[PDB]
Amino acid sequence: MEVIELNKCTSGQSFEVILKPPSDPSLEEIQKKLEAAEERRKYQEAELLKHLAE
Amino acid sequence: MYTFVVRDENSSVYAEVSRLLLATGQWKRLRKDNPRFNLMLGERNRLPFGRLGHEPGLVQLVNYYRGADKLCRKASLVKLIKTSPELSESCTWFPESYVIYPDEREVFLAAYNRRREGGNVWIAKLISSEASELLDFIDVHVIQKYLEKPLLLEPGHRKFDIRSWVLVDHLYNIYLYREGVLRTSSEPYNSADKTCHLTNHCIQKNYGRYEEGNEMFFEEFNQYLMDALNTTLENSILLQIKHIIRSCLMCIEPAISTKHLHYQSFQLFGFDFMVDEELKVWLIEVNGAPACAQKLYAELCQGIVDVAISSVFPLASIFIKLHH
Amino acid sequence: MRECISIHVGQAGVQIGNACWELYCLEHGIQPDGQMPSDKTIGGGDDSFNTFFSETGAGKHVPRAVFVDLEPTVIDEVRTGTYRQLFHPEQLITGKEDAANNYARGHYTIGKEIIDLVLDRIRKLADQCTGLQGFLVFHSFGGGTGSGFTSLLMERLSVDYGKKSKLEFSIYPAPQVSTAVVEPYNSILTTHTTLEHSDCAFMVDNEAIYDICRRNLDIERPTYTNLNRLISQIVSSITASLRFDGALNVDLTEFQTNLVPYPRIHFPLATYAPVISAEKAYHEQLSVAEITNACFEPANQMVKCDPRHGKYMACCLLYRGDVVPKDVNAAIATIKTKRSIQFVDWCPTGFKVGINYQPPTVVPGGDLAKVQRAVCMLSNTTAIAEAWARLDHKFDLMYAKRAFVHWYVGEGMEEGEFSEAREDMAALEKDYEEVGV
Amino acid sequence: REIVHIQAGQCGNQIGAKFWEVISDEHGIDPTGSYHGDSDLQLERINVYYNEATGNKYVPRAILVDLEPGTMDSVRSGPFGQIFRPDNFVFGQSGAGNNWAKGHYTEGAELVDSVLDVVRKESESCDCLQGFQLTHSLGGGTGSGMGTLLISKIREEYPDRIMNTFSVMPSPKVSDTVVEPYNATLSVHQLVENTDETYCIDNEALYDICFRTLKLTTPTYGDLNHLVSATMSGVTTCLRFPGQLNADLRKLAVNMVPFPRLHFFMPGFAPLTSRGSQQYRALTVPELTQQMFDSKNMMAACDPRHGRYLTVAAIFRGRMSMKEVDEQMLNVQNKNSSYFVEWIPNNVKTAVCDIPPRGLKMSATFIGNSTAIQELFKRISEQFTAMFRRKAFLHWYTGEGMDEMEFTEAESNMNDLVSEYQQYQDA
Ligand SMILES: Nc1nc2c(ncn2[C@@H]2O[C@H](COP(=O)(O)OP(=O)(O)OP(=O)(O)O)[C@@H](O)[C@H]2O)c(=O)[nH]1
Ligand SMILES: Nc1ncnc2c1ncn2[C@@H]1O[C@H](COP(=O)(O)OP(=O)(O)CP(=O)(O)O)[C@@H](O)[C@H]1O
Ligand SMILES: Nc1nc2c(ncn2[C@@H]2O[C@H](COP(=O)(O)OP(=O)(O)O)[C@@H](O)[C@H]2O)c(=O)[nH]1
Ligand SMILES: COc1ccc2c(c1)NC(=O)CN2c1nc(C)nc2c1CCC2
Numbered sequence A: 001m002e003v004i005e006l007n008k009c010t011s012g013q014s015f016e017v018i019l020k021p022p023s024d025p026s027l028e029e030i031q032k033k034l035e036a037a038e039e040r041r042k043y044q045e046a047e048l049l050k051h052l053a054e
Numbered sequence B: 001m002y003t004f005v006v007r008d009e010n011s012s013v014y015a016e017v018s019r020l021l022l023a024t025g026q027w028k029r030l031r032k033d034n035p036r037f038n039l040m041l042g043e044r045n046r047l048p049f050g051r052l053g054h055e056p057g058l059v060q061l062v063n064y065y066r067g068a069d070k071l072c073r074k075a076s077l078v079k080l081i082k083t084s085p086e087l088s089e090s091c092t093w094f095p096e097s098y099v100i101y102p103d104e105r106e107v108f109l110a111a112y113n114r115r116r117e118g119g120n121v122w123i124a125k126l127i128s129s130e131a132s133e134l135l136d137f138i139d140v141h142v143i144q145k146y147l148e149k150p151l152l153l154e155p156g157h158r159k160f161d162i163r164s165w166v167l168v169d170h171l172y173n174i175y176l177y178r179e180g181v182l183r184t185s186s187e188p189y190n191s192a193d194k195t196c197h198l199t200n201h202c203i204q205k206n207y208g209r210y211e212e213g214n215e216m217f218f219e220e221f222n223q224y225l226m227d228a229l230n231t232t233l234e235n236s237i238l239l240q241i242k243h244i245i246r247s248c249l250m251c252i253e254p255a256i257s258t259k260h261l262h263y264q265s266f267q268l269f270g271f272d273f274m275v276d277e278e279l280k281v282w283l284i285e286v287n288g289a290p291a292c293a294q295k296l297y298a299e300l301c302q303g304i305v306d307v308a309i310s311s312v313f314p315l316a317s318i319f320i321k322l323h324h
Numbered sequence C: 001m002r003e004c005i006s007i008h009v010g011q012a013g014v015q016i017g018n019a020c021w022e023l024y025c026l027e028h029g030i031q032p033d034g035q036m037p038s039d040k041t042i043g044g045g046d047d048s049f050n051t052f053f054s055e056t057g058a059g060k061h062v063p064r065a066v067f068v069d070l071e072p073t074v075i076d077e078v079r080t081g082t083y084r085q086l087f088h089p090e091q092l093i094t095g096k097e098d099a100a101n102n103y104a105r106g107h108y109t110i111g112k113e114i115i116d117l118v119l120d121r122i123r124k125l126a127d128q129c130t131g132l133q134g135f136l137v138f139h140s141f142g143g144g145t146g147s148g149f150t151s152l153l154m155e156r157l158s159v160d161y162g163k164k165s166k167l168e169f170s171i172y173p174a175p176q177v178s179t180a181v182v183e184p185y186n187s188i189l190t191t192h193t194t195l196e197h198s199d200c201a202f203m204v205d206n207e208a209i210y211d212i213c214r215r216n217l218d219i220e221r222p223t224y225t226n227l228n229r230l231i232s233q234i235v236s237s238i239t240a241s242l243r244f245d246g247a248l249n250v251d252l253t254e255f256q257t258n259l260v261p262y263p264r265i266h267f268p269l270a271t272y273a274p275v276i277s278a279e280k281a282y283h284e285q286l287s288v289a290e291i292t293n294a295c296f297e298p299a300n301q302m303v304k305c306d307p308r309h310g311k312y313m314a315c316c317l318l319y320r321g322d323v324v325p326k327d328v329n330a331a332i333a334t335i336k337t338k339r340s341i342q343f344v345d346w347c348p349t350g351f352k353v354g355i356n357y358q359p360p361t362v363v364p365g366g367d368l369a370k371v372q373r374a375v376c377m378l379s380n381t382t383a384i385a386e387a388w389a390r391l392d393h394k395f396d397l398m399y400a401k402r403a404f405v406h407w408y409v410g411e412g413m414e415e416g417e418f419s420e421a422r423e424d425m426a427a428l429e430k431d432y433e434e435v436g437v
Numbered sequence D: 001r002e003i004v005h006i007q008a009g010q011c012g013n014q015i016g017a018k019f020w021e022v023i024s025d026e027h028g029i030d031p032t033g034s035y036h037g038d039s040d041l042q043l044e045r046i047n048v049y050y051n052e053a054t055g056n057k058y059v060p061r062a063i064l065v066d067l068e069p070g071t072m073d074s075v076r077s078g079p080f081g082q083i084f085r086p087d088n089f090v091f092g093q094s095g096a097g098n099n100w101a102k103g104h105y106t107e108g109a110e111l112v113d114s115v116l117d118v119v120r121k122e123s124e125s126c127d128c129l130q131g132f133q134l135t136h137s138l139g140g141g142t143g144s145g146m147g148t149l150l151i152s153k154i155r156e157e158y159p160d161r162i163m164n165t166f167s168v169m170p171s172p173k174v175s176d177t178v179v180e181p182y183n184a185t186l187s188v189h190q191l192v193e194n195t196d197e198t199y200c201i202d203n204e205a206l207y208d209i210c211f212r213t214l215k216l217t218t219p220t221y222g223d224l225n226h227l228v229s230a231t232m233s234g235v236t237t238c239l240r241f242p243g244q245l246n247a248d249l250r251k252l253a254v255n256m257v258p259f260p261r262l263h264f265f266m267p268g269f270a271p272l273t274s275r276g277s278q279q280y281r282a283l284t285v286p287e288l289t290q291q292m293f294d295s296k297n298m299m300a301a302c303d304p305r306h307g308r309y310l311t312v313a314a315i316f317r318g319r320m321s322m323k324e325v326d327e328q329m330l331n332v333q334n335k336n337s338s339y340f341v342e343w344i345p346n347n348v349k350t351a352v353c354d355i356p357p358r359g360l361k362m363s364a365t366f367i368g369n370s371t372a373i374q375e376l377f378k379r380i381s382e383q384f385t386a387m388f389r390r391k392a393f394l395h396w397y398t399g400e401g402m403d404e405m406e407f408t409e410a411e412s413n414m415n416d417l418v419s420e421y422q423q424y425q426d427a
């Protein structure tokens, strides 16, 4: 087994052992979808208050 | 009560296991996709092992070993025997085999050319000499040495294969069913047409001449070996079979064992063997979803409940344990 | 030195953050009032622990942390707890009403009201950083705040800090300890929205740590305090390299380099050993070989799965205690001959090992006993996809009947986001199987 | 997270008064509003149902509504009557005469605005209002007719708050008038639209329990209300006391209601106890679990084996092994998995409170959203149709301005509710 890149310090040791070798959306778009859902909420509430007005 | 589900209705074996479980009065069956089961008699393809063992308050058991397909596929078995040092390339009970992709072609051709200096009959899975024919027939298959000198029963000069049923429980105990069957060829064996060369039940449909259903069981075959060859089934054949079953399952135990798993597995295996004219046993294939013989369905399936199911879910020997 | 900011969202994120920061102070020798007599550079410095702590003129060591919850009763216990002096009031943010186990209520309705405040408080910590690497985000999959608001936060952190890494410590839902029936919905929704914004996510199935507490700690009914003290031990093992001198996993980018070759497959499996009960009078201390062998038992993993029926892409061994490289290599040699450890053909078969000589630190009066050596294994195995199969199947059962969907649509969410999130999960499952078969 | 309690009509105020009697004793508050308890678990979440008053008295956040002064004067004379804020008494003089139309359209319209003024003053003082809980019957006129008019108007002013009700269903076994199926069918139509959670307290189920199980030959309303007050205490345990689950009304609705219209819960209680009767053997955890699921313990006269549980909630109260509670609850689900829908995984959630109710060392309260509740609505739909096919007694309602068309609409909607509960009984 190969043991490579052994680094030692006073806190401990680091190394690597090898056995076998190989064989975003914009802020503009985020706010737009946050307000498209708020629009849908206010619509659904408006339909409720319209129904209660009847 | 215990609860179980059935996800393979085409399973002749576990159809009988379901009836026996229900008749106990301590097992009730749920719907296919009800998660609150104790036992799963699952499907054969893409069984969801990743969903087992996550129901609180339920000990879950399944009738299949995840990863056992590497022993029950013709291509997987050959790769396993060659690459596993427990079995090795020098394995004395497996015929020479090579995996061909329509590969090992160049390495295979070297053996077939070394077979030209001398018999060179092979089978692909069909049967042919020389071997150039079968390659164009293949165009995944596996080519294997055809056993040209098999043991032939008399009267009839017949070919046969030996099927042994093996159950491995949640503890990885290996249970060999004391009852096996010889699937006979009711056609005389011709060394120079595949009805005599292939011993499959469906291929035989001279059928039924010497015994009912072309199925000779162990009692008659033992008496034949005594009268004809002055030996017994135990000494001449069954010792090698138990060695091959033991060796094959001990090899893959680290890969399939459910000893410390959140769910448990058992599985019924069907081992098929070939016997040559010198009473040497050869393993040909392993089946992960085998069907039993009608004469033995009642006894074997009852032994599955006793040994594999009731051992985990107890209520209010027909096997030979292979020791390791 | 480069700083890391921790963000704790929802109940699970806050209480686990409590456990971690309690453990950090004990390891680094920081007192509940923020004082650290070990520190000789008063008022600042670029030591390794300053990655997680800032320093004031009075000598206080302040966590680079922000706690967010849409409902105040959980963070209020932090405001009056043992470490109340540790945190500044501005880095503890609470709302009035929570998300009610509703992803859409935490992401859209209530999340919009508080997101700009949190990012401002987050910006106040980043302005005290000379070289910010990124963020560690602690949250739950099932919570309405842990799922809904975190995904909204992860979206905005990618916008405001594009060149920074973002790691997750996510609590996978387990019905044994959860009180919400719609956690598969919240989990799939938040995994879909966060996937492209998270560079590395360490999942912790509550079922796994629950049974570990039952089996190995002799605790009949483990509480969140039992669970979180064990979780923080694993988290500390993972973050020890960022807080201590060493050469392995020194920055957040090295986590993705060493563990995540495929961006979408960024869910390493964590296995930890030994977990020993403090009430066990007689205990035989386990060797390097025994604890390294335990890293391959599913009973010790943070997610119950079978790594034998998958393939590895990377594997780190993080040792704490009396461990030397000679014994690690001997243990690895014997383990390879006896276990099914299959790497993908485009990866080298090997382990990156990090050893910290200081043994694991335990909370006084806790359930964990002091061990002479422990190890946490980080292994990116395709076997962890079993948890996605479990989660997606439960999602499929409920969504086929549109059960509870009206709660999410009633918060402005469209029914299309469900199937959009589920198709992404379907793509993730096939990516795993393509690599692992 | 404060809750505004409202009680309307004769039945609503009598079970409402007994509710405040029971939970004031649990929280250690005397009739004078002073606290004289031992544990501080009694005061941690006391803000949910009580306002802290002068001298640190505790005044219930309760609003008492009726169209006649009779029953409400009985409340003020009752054992805890002086604990209620006197300004929250709102009453007319005409009464409603068991007439849904009088309560909902004529007599109750005169009084509803003054009720909303008291509701508004209680809500503006709330730090974070959860919603409302209403106690009322559906067979009378005030609690049924005016109660639903209040619910409709409360939803208009507070559209983002939870509406919870304790609704007593009529039964010919405990019948005041023949027109009770009319008032119930008219009220259920309103409850389907304008409430988030309704506890179906069936007077038929309360009668059979008092008769068949408790061996009371002639049950009074006091015997029926003893069962109501025990259930109301249990179902509100996780709202009033701290535990591993500090529940609220919204989380309760989100987790119990998979489809908005199917929000009618079968309550259940164990052990069943008769008044003034002391039994000295505490029940084991297996016994509480088996009984609380028994049909004989359901407060709605429905056979749960005729349907399937969509969601289940359970409260165990007392000193007991929570592990044994886990084992026994998991046992019921794994032993009767047929009666829980498989398309809502892990649809049973349980909580444990250390403080038991008065008189019992161990108790269990059952909250079930079962599709078998359609039997209750079927029963009332049959009694409704028997009279309505002859338009019998309709003149009492048309004389207050109602049209036959409104009865047909209410009949249709309840039959639709029955069909919708039948939709998921087979899926
Ligand atoms: N390990 C652990 N899991 C927790 C803890 N608290 C909650 N959970 C899990 O988190 C899930 C519920 O999410 P929560 O974090 O409680 O909810 P939230 O993030 O506050 O969101 P909302 O309450 O809905 O507004 C459940 O599956 C719990 O099991 C904790 O302290 N430790
Ligand atoms: N190397 C070989 N030498 C001689 N005969 C062989 C042979 N390989 C196969 N056979 C014959 O071929 C028959 C069928 O082969 P095989 O068992 O692989 O197919 P199969 O898998 O479809 C039947 P099963 O699944 O029940 O075992 C065997 O019964 C045997 O008689
Ligand atoms: N359980 C119970 N039911 C009651 C009580 N009082 C009345 N009822 C029922 O409620 C219906 C009568 O409604 P009621 O409240 O008296 O009319 P209201 O005053 O106009 O609201 C009948 O079906 C009664 O059986 C009570 O104290 N307890
Ligand atoms: C079906 O799954 C459920 C069912 C109910 C709830 C929850 C999940 N979860 C909650 O937070 C609220 N809740 C509850 N509410 C209230 C007020 N009393 C109780 C519970 C559960 C136990 C008693």
Ligand SMILES: [Ca+2]
Pocket (backbone or CB within 6 Å): C039, C040, C041, C042, C043, C044, C045, C055
């Ligand atoms: Ca310093």
Ligand SMILES: [Mg+2]
Pocket (backbone or CB within 6 Å): C010, C011, C071, C098, C143, C145
């Ligand atoms: Mg919360």
Ligand SMILES: [Mg+2]
Pocket (backbone or CB within 6 Å): D010, D140, D176
């Ligand atoms: Mg009356």
